[PDB]
Structure 1
Amino acid sequence: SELLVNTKSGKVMGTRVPVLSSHISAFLGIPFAEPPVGNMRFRRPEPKKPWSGVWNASTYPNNCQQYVDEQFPGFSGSEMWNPNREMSEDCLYLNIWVPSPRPKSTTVMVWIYGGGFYSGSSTLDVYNGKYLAYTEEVVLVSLSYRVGAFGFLALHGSQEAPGNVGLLDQRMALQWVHDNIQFFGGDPKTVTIFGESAGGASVGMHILSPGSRDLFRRAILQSGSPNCPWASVSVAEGRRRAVELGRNLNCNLNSDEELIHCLREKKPQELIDVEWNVLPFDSIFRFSFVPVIDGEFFPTSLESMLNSGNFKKTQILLGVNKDEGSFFLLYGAPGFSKDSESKISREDFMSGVKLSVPHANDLGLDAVTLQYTDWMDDNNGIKNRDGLDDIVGDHNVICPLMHFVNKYTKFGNGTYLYFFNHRASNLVWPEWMGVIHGYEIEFVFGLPLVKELNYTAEEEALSRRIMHYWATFAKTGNPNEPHSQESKWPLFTTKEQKFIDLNTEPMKVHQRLRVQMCVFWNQFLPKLLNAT
């Protein structure tokens, strides 16, 4: 049977699912690690021990314990990102979509959801992997990993809560894929890991980490890169936060042993409820428990590894969306509302840049402000809104990614950069938010191909070319089909620095994506701040 598979660990029974007037195979909730529960909470994940009999893999598994967004209850625009299954610590599972009839040894794509390393689920409606698998005939894998404290509590020196275990869960799902994807018609030698936001950062951390390097061939990073300011902390910062987490729950703080034993006695939701209390400053686009530069999963600073070319050499495809910042300003900055134009006064702009660049001293904030203010028209609420938007998106996403692409390229074997700037005709968020962080995803997953979701014809077409670029990149390492008559996404090179827009207009090639502002964020500000 097409739906029964003999994996290394045990047998698996999938389910046939309809997809655009056809069908394909799905294997949902397949375990790839022993449940990280009880005294195992905060520990490195252990391989799932073999099982006898058939594993029912016909339904999505649990989502990991995480903070649920309740800003807009019942609003589809936000809840579309919330867990849609029972949360549980027993959440280490992956999902596979296999074309029917089963392919021989085809391209694999592994999806690593984002969500600031504090949230995310593999089961969301926007991650339904059937359309992409079916349309591009690839084997699509959806993995999961512990988020928040559960996946990132870092008490360096301790083997009970070493940190980076959520990144280690990802690696184990990858190893799983490497050991078994062949039984599903996938080529373990041609696996592309791709992810958005903390998912794009994860992908890049696997490109850097020596222990993850050989578990994949190529990589795709969307709206996130490993060196993002919010994607990692030092061992000290990691330890301070874990200690503060304990102080927040009246834990014994004599030793890591006692602190850790204490935390393992708290119910999940108890940790979640104080999770945000450990951050250094009041801010936006900052998350509590994230990867740590431990000298193990990450041998040295991300920067030195990047400067010395100490990373996996291969082809990467990555890009950003036009308004990566709006989502965050809406949730945590004064002046912004989802029920208005959110025109920002000069006062709100000032408090806004402070909430956005939390680590900056006075001189630093002055420089940012100077950088994003039109002093001829400084009371213009629209300019102030768009100004703060760009601040948040340039600082947290775009410039850190450009820094990364520019470094990676000196050593890599092929880079393709994109700027997604298409505002969906059916977006549920207000107009001022633009092409929001996370909204190219529905195009990558081909949701526009399901007529009942009301996308325009041209949107279906955009979705089809994006999936084709992705899959084609995945199979070959170049998004372009050889000897094709269509316009060509050119190679990004350190000398030319070319990239394309991704929208419904005919492709356009541009150069030096946001250089001005990125020269500021990547070179100048860092210096100004170092000078102190």
Structure 2
Amino acid sequence: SELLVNTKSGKVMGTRVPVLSSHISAFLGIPFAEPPVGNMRFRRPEPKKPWSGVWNASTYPNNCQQYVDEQFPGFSGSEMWNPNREMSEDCLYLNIWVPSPRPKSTTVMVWIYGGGFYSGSSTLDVYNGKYLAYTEEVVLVSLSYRVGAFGFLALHGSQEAPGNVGLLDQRMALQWVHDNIQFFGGDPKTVTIFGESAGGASVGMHILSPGSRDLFRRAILQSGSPNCPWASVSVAEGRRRAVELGRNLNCNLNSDEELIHCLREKKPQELIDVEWNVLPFDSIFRFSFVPVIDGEFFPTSLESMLNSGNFKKTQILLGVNKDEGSFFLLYGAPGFSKDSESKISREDFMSGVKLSVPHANDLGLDAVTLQYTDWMDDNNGIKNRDGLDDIVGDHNVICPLMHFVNKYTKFGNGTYLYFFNHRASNLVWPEWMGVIHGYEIEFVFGLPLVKELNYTAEEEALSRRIMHYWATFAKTGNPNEPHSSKWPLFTTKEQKFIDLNTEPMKVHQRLRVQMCVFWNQFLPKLLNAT
């Protein structure tokens, strides 16, 4: 009744779920695509053919095939991001939380997970949509999309592996929401897409892409933006990496057809076991199979589209965390450890700068080093550690996002910018890692409202504040409720943003402006000239 919904592709039966001493409706694992298996590996997705009978939507779906992180086996801080369901190429499903009783036509929020375009799952505990759906009375959808080679192997000119098909998975789930969310009490004209890291870059890519623009109303980007250096490659580099994948697996490389036929014969984990081998440099915060600037999903270069205003004009809300770079250093840079303060020697600092800016020549590396080194105190291991942390976060997340925010605001209809700098009281990671990439998600999704998880009362209040900003923005284009302190519009001239933490809101201006002139203006000019 409330749990039995007839959609344009067939009937679905959801389940009644408890939430915070109440209940709401969950529809888990609804298919929005034909399974992209067999001959459909690497191909654009196809709409799900209608089914007869009742689709059982009581259980989370499979997760897409991906490299599983084993660096810290059994450690919750890393395991919380790994697939928690069986992995399968048959993974194109979405999940829906609906307030109970079903509202008439309410705001919809669609979550796009991150994971560097090589990993990610809609089913992680921190993406549980029920607290936000219940607390803010929104219809909350989480989609899925192919990652790694399965989603982003790009042999431009082939229609069998054109590239960007994981972005097209996202778009097909948005099309399904557009066509069906009315049956779940959602308003298809008031859909907000939001996501973090690669999911934030994805949100920005749909803002840019003409074929995506009519499938949502407004957007939220968390710790990612479409212009991030890791978020896309050229057609030539994508082809190079695809050919090198075939080389690693002893494939015929004489033609796209023969290469693709070979790759389609391999078991999924065979592809995954060599995926990191196709990267051109030793690096951190770089991923093998990512979106390609193809001339179709992206009609021209990202920068030209931003400069000309060739993008969807709407409201955006976006922001970054204080220490975006810290876990990346843990995973690939010398001298870092989860079990120590990770004081970094001068030698390991120089190695880390090179891993962090792998495309830079030696003069570019010198420029980065000078910008982040205190030459009154250059053997300070804490300053070396924190300097590397800032390099990774500034280069890969904060300054790309500030470039996006300044270009977008010239043409958009409203920008709201935040700086999340609260360290959770119950964090399992060491203090040197600070406010880590991804650790605002648990506040956005209301996990501190769960007493059993042992957040402080101020952390519950912060989460409620953030959920209300997010959902009020989603409903109206403005995070502030009329009548009371106000989160001010970010403007080209004043460039205001707010901190998000347990203290009373403070307004600041020009987020990280000094370092981002270096990353966005000077270093690109230096690398181009040298």
**Fold conserved (TM > 0.5)?**
yes
Where 2:5 maps in the other structure, the secondary structure is strand
Distance, in Å, in 2 between the alignment partners of 1:70 and 1:14 is 34
TM-score (norm 2): 1.00
Once the two structures are superposed, what CA deviation does each residue of 1:469-526 show, in whole Å capped at 9, x if it has no partner?
Answer: 0000000000000112xx1100000100000000000000000000100000000000
Q: What are the superposed Cα offsets for residues 343-396 of structure 1, whole Å, 9 maximum, x if unpaired? A: 001110000000000000000000000000000100000000000000000000
Where 2:210 maps in the other structure, the secondary structure is coil
Q: CA deviation at 1:26?
A: 0.2
Output aligned runs, 1:99-498, within 5 Å.
Answer: 99-484=99-484, 487-498=485-496
SS at match of 2:265: coil
* 1:96-143: CA deviation from partner (whole Å, max 9, x where unpaired): 000000000000000000000000000000000000000000000000
Query: How big is each residue's C-alpha offset from its partner over 1:136-189, in whole Å with a ceiling of 9 and x where there is no partner?
Result: 000000000000000000000000000000000000000000000000000000
* SS of corresponding position for 1:471: helix
Residue-by-residue CA offset, 1:35-90 (whole Å, 9 max, x unaligned): 00000000000000001110000000000000000000000000000000000000
**Counterpart of 1:324 in 2: which secondary structure?**
coil
> Which of 493, 501, 504 is 1:503 aligned to?
501
CA-to-aligned-CA distance 1:241-275 (integer Å, 9 cap, x gap): 00000000000000000000000000000000000
The CA deviation at 1:410 is 0.1
Distance (Å, rounded) in 1 between the aligned partners of 2:435 and 2:100: 35
Distance 1:260 1:38 in 2: 12
CA distance in 2 between counterparts of 1:307 and 1:3 reads: 47
SS across alignment from 1:510: strand
Rounded to whole Å, the distance in 2 between the matches of 1:330 and 1:323 is 13
CA distance in 1, matches of 2:325, 2:357: 13
> What TM-score, normalized to structure 1?
1.00
Output the CA distance in 2 between the equivalents of 1:506 and 1:178: 38
Q: CA deviation at 1:297?
A: 0.1
Once residues 426 and 473 of structure 1 are traced to their aligned partners in structure 2, the CA distance between those partners, rounded to angstroms, is 29
SS class of match (1:404): helix
Taking the aligned partners of 2:58 and 2:476, their CA distance within structure 1 comes to 31
Distance 1:78 1:310 in 2: 39
Structure 1: how far apart are the matches of 2:137 and 2:7?
21
CA deviation profile, 1:388-407 (whole Å, cap 9, x unmatched): 00000000000000000000
Q: How much identity, in percent, do the aligned residues show? A: 100
Structure 2 distance, partners of 1:232, 1:85, is 28
Residue aligned with 1:6, SS: strand
> RMSD in angstroms over aligned alpha carbons?
0.3
Measured after TM superposition, the shift of residue 207 of structure 1 is 0.1
Residue 468 of structure 1, CA deviation: 0.2
Q: CA deviation at 1:335?
A: 0.5
- Residues of 2 paired with 1:344 and 1:124: CA distance? 33
Deviations 1:203-233 (A, max 9, x none): 0000000000000000000000000000000
**SS of residue matched to 1:17:** strand
For 1:362 and 1:72, the matched residues in 2 are separated by: 34
How much does 1:31 deviate?
A: 0.1
* Separation (CA, whole Å) in 2 of partners of 1:72 and 1:526: 36
The CA deviation at 1:94 is 0.1
Between the aligned partners of 1:104 and 1:465, the Cα distance in structure 2 is 25
Cα distance in 2 for partners of 1:504, 1:21 equals 25
Q: Separation in 1 of the partners of 2:430 and 2:260?
A: 44
Instruction: Structure 2: state its 5+ residue gaps.
Output: none
Indicate the SS of the match to 1:313. coil
- 1:4 Cα shift? 0.3
- Using the TM superposition, give the Cα deviation of residue 457 of structure 1 relative to its aligned residue in structure 2, in angstroms: 0.2
Stretches of 4+ aligned residues off by more than 6 angstroms: none
The SS at the match of 2:480 is coil
Other structure's SS at 2:199 match: helix
User: Structure 1: 5+ residue runs without aligned partners?
Assistant: none
